[PDB]
């Protein structure tokens, strides 16, 4: 349907971002979300139509020609309940939301265009006074954030329309338990002047690794206890661009339909990484550009007032640990220290992305590198 089709259109407007991305700058510890971002702005192209509904969605790797409206919408119609079933093995979420002004003449070719089945929350708070206005919508963002993070904005200005939010986050879980106890700190390398005291997870196992040629690395598809379809992505020797250069959907397709085990003493590092953006730096010049801008028609919401997008902005916080221990949380043969060409260290940079087993997108698509910043 769409796990053929949007989906891998949906591996690449992610993709179609980030090799423009990286134009921005280097050390820059990333992570930007496919799923929750196209599902929060190309719902919007539902109500919105006229020019946007092409260029804030064909950008996106489509083109409305062998691919109408129909398995387009119908994609996300799928996605959200084909993705989100009742399971003892995790939960992915993430919202949007949309708070307006008080004072105009609200109508629905746009705004009840996005109810549809994932009814929005439209809603009209006052903008005149910025302050209430900056909490009332970082505070949305602290309901699914639960004590993630909030601030989403702390600046608004009295010429804002109204804008658009998000609150993508995670708690980690997996089925290869790596050691609650043996965690050797060791240290993390960079490009060549660098010695990182990074958190060192560890545990031996016949784990799925099945390194790969035609990008220079070492997978690692360990899967999380239950859908949650792990991708990682290790170098050769500090040789970083390829990897990640190389990458239709295609590719990690074929790593995806696999189960090859492998002797060795696998070596990962902990953490947790905010890769916060606003939607602009590589939305309004990879292609999504009008909209938001104060140069075209963003109405549909009313009938009343020259709207536009004010300051759409996406949410991320993924967390790396330990977490999974119910009744039989347990590293069954723990005394196994089998190994060919094993101690896959974590020692360095490397680069990831998490996809879905329920509907197989990327929905988390970032790196870790130099630890320290913030």
Request: glycine letters at 6%; aromatic letters at 10%.
């Amino acid at each position: 349907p769409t796990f053929n089709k949007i989906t891998p259109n949906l591996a690449e407007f992610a993709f179609s971002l980030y090799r423009q991305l990286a134009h921005q700058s280097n050390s820059t510890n990333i992570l930007f979300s496919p799923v929750s971002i196209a599902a929060a702005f190309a719902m919007l192209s539902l109500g919105a139509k006229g020019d946007t509904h092409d260029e804030i969605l064909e950008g996106l790797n489509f083109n409305l020609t062998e691919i109408p409206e129909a398995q387009i919408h119908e994609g996300f119609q799928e996605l959200l309940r084909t993705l989100n079933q009742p399971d003892s093995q995790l939960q992915l979420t993430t919202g949007n939301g949309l708070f307006l002004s008080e004072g105009l003449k609200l109508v629905d070719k746009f705004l009840e265009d996005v109810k549809k089945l994932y009814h929005s929350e439209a809603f009209t708070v006052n903008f005149g006074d910025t302050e209430e206005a900056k909490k009332q919508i970082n505070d949305y963002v602290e309901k699914g954030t639960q004590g993630k993070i909030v601030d989403l904005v702390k600046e608004l200005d009295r010429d804002t329309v109204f804008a658009l939010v998000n609150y993508i986050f995670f708690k980690g879980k997996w089925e290869r338990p790596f050691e609650v106890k043996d965690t050797e700190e060791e240290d993390f390398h960079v490009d060549q002047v660098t010695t990182v005291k990074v958190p060192m997870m560890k545990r031996l196992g016949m784990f799925n690794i099945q390194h790969c040629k035609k990008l220079s690395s070492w997978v690692l598809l360990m899967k999380y206890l239950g859908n949650a379809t792990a991708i990682f992505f290790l170098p050769d020797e500090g040789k970083l661009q390829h990897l990640e250069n190389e990458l239709t959907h295609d590719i990690i397709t074929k790593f995806l339909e696999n189960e090859d085990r492998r002797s060795a003493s696998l070596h990962l590092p902990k953490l947790s990484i905010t890769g916060t953006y606003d939607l602009k730096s590589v939305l309004g010049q990879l292609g999504i550009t009008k909209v938001f801008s104060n140069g075209a028609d963003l109405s549909g919401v009313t009938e009343e007032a020259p709207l536009k997008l004010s300051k759409a902005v996406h949410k991320a916080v993924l967390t790396i640990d330990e977490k999974g221990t119910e009744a039989a949380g347990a590293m069954f043969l723990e005394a196994i220290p089998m190994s060919i060409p094993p101690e896959v260290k974590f020692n360095k940079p490397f680069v990831f992305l998490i996809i879905e087993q329920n509907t197989k997108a990327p929905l988390f698509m970032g790196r870790v590198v130099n630890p320290t910043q913030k």
